[PDB]
Amino acid sequence: PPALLRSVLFAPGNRADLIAKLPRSAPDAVVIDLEDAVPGTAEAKAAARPVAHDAARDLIAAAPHLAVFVRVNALHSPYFEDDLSVLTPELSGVVVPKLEMGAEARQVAQMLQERSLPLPILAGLETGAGVWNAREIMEVPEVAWAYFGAEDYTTDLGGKRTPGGLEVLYARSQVALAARLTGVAALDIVVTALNDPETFRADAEQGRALGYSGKLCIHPAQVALAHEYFG
Amino acid sequence: PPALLRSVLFAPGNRADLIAKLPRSAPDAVVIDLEDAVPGTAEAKAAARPVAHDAARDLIAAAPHLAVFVRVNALHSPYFEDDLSVLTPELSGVVVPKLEMGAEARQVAQMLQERSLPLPILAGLETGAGVWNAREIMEVPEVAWAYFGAEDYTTDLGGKRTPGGLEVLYARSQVALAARLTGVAALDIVVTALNDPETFRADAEQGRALGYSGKLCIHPAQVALAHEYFG
Amino acid sequence: PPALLRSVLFAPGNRADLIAKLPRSAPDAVVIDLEDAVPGTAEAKAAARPVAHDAARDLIAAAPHLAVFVRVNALHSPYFEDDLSVLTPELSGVVVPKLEMGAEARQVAQMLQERSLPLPILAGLETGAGVWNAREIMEVPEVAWAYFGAEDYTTDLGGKRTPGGLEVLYARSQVALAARLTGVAALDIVVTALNDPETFRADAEQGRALGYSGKLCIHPAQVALAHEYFG
């Protein structure tokens, strides 16, 4: 995949239909999500694995030039292990959420290698420890890109999100700087307000000014908006 | 004392009458202050010790559940040593202002134990070094809560305070993050404007969004406002 | 040169005429610039050196009490070595842009010592690494002052500058804090807009609030304005 992704669009791993609609807006990359998008039960996570596996295969064959990623559950969740069975060399990479130390990313890299699944890692820095150890996490060789997850960050610190985002400015700035120092591409925060392009435009602008090279998108319409600011 | 304190109300150590009025606003915790609240004269300090002691003694008995703290003078001040003699096991904890190194916090903890005073420490992070070494200070076991003192922080850096507080956003964000990583309760900055409830409301909202679990209060009226945002 | 510089005014190193005007606004210090001010070709830099060298000399003889500095090119640039010949013992010091490690600053000090140039360093922290290692760079003994260059910082991170400057608040606050902790005087960012003193006034105000003790100036008119805020 390109070292630069201007837009990264998500779809629930257990929604074959939404996964297939992923290329419509032509995002630079997409993420079939087995984490947040799917219920936290052993049953839901198991049911989602074959669905996302086949959906990923179909998608890559239909849109050969689309960078396709799969987001697995956190390293320390009881789902990480079995999520790996979903991966294939055809994916552009694997998204690992809530990483918190360089050792965790190295563990991930080694486990992937032992499953014969050499996939670059798109690191999720979205907790206090992830931000604090941002540089150490991104210096792991296998980490090619990273996103700052404001939503989980504030939840982790017992904070609350605002439109301006001053409450995550410190964190968002640290991640962008650590990303520059390690040669890793930084992906900006999601925008949950889906009814106003203006709210998104203002947010993307802040992210661009900070040095992020791309932005996470949760709705197709945000893709075109993202391309007006990154790239 | 509770792990979380929504409000912490201050009262001058040498003002036995005000100390007694403390329970009125029903704050989660109160601080009998021998530091800033009293004049910096070797005589005005030694004269405040007996008044603070006797006032704290009677206050704790009058409201046994209420978390009662006494703020002593800085570790390297000429008053610290003698201030300790004022403390008692019945206190919920001791407030130590201007801590700047993990080593200073450990020193305080050791001295307290040697004086047979089992008191958890409420660390004052309000200087450049305090903020810089926030995590190292807060990881000391005896430290249970910590507050960011914007007033003395700006004074220490030669800065100046504003209503928006952007000049201490980096510092306030760093303390909140370090508090999370160490399991320490973070207490937000004071609001010196005692005539406008909107200034406090907006200020408290910023602290809450950043991850603070409580806020320092200098006037009984701010207590109710604090509980509107923290809890 | 005093430990405190409220204003530091720049002039192109290849303009003998502009350099001569430097003393008119009575800035606390002046900088004859061989770096950004002079085009990036071996021809333009070599042509600039004798002018900066002699103009600096004529300046010191005319204004004996003025702190005169020369800004050489970056340490790892192909012009650094030759730029050193422009320096003389009579200068108040030398500005070294884009410093990124403590070791780089020590290298400069060493090379200055072997040339018999007792010139303290005014370090330029204006790239991701410069900000990341701000404290280590400033703890180098010969570093007496440091400036934060928001322009090159955002360029280095691939961001964009805004009037409000929230995109560089993190870095600006960090440089100011590190300067306090190392005993180094921190100089605030340049203001490129010259048609409005109000834009400069608001900016200087932000810098002062964060703890900066002086501000870089690129137009003599900014000198008096800086003096209203610093000192």
Ligand SMILES: O=C([O-])CC(=O)C(=O)O
């Ligand atoms: O799942 C989503 O839609 C967005 C997400 O995880 C994130 O921004 O971290």
Ligand SMILES: O=C([O-])CC(=O)C(=O)O
């Ligand atoms: O004593 C006060 O009024 C305020 C105080 O200590 C602080 O903000 O740290």
Ligand SMILES: O=C([O-])CC(=O)C(=O)O
């Ligand atoms: O060259 C200039 O005029 C200003 C400059 O380098 C800076 O602010 O770093």
Ligand SMILES: [Mg+2]
């Ligand atoms: Mg997320």
Ligand SMILES: [Mg+2]
């Ligand atoms: Mg205080």
Ligand SMILES: [Mg+2]
């Ligand atoms: Mg510069």
